Ligand SMILES: NC(=O)c1c(N)c(C(=O)c2ccc(F)cc2)n2ccccc12
């Protein structure tokens with residue numbers, strides 16, 4: 001019937017997928033919102049915007065498209081820009097009126113990030129929910145497609161994965177070039193559309209030597225990020241990990257991928273130079289890794305050429 005219904009999903013988190021954001025424990029097992037019995041953190045799995053709601057008098061909400069780290073991802077029409085679809089994501093699990101307002105300022109700089117292979121941020125907006133409480137939303141480009149997220153039985157051939165990350169590295173270079181790192185590179189964060197690849201999640205983007213270390217997904221984070229903070233080197237590491245996760249059979253512990261490589265992997269015995277590149281990328285010592293994304297790109301170009309050649 002209506003073409004937009006298809007892009008969207010049923011706005012309930014099934015009980016299976018319901019966990020606390022602060023402790024990982026399966027809350028809502030069946031209150032949809034409330035406080036976690038085990039850590040006292042507030043949670044809600046209910047959509048905070050509903051179809052028909054109009055945010056900042058500009059964004060007409062049509063419903064939800066996914067649910068993730070911070071809650072629901074909403075799809076809205078932008079009534080300024082010819083009713084083109086955009087995405088609304090929240091900013092913090094909770095805060096007062098001041099905290100939300102602060103949260104937006106901490107993230108306001110993302111405006112300036114402009115590259116063909118990164119989601120465009122359009123706007124940052126307040127919505128007064130049913131309770132007079134103001135909630136901050138980031139407005140961003142709706143990129144239709146699927147993530148490169150591949151589970152055990154659907155791992156990408158090496159040629160294809162390399163091709164993808166060669167499209168991504170430029171975007172990292174760009175970020176690096178303007179004093180920024182994309183701390184959260186992983187298959188789940190790269191979207192393959194009918195045209196191109198895009199990076200979608202800018203919640204981890206930071207400045208080089210930005211305060212703290214709470215940047216990005218474990219199993220992909222470089223080991224030294226606690227002491228170094230986010231650096232080009234920690235980004236390079238995520239790339240090696242991302243390539244690993246796309247192509248190799250990685251063991252897990254407690255849902256997280258294990259550090260290092262399954263050192264006797266079929267794929268890795270096969271593509272001698274790819275394996276060497278992977279190893280260089282994720283080297284425990286930041287200094288042993290590729291010094292630049294451009295550098296890694298150049299060497300990874302070589303490896304593609306070698307991989308295609310060996311494929312016959
Ligand atoms: N800016 C987007 O377009 C966007 C997006 N598409 C997603 C998804 O997680 C997703 C994946 C497949 C789908 F079919 C629908 C949604 N996302 C998640 C976080 C931030 C932005 C976005």
Ligand SMILES: [Fe+3]
Pocket residue numbers: 020021022023024025027036037038039040041
């Ligand atoms: Fe909890």
Ligand code: NA
Pocket residue numbers: 069184201203216217
């Ligand atoms: Na994330």
Ligand code: NA
Pocket residue numbers: 181182183184230231233234235238
């Ligand atoms: Na990083």
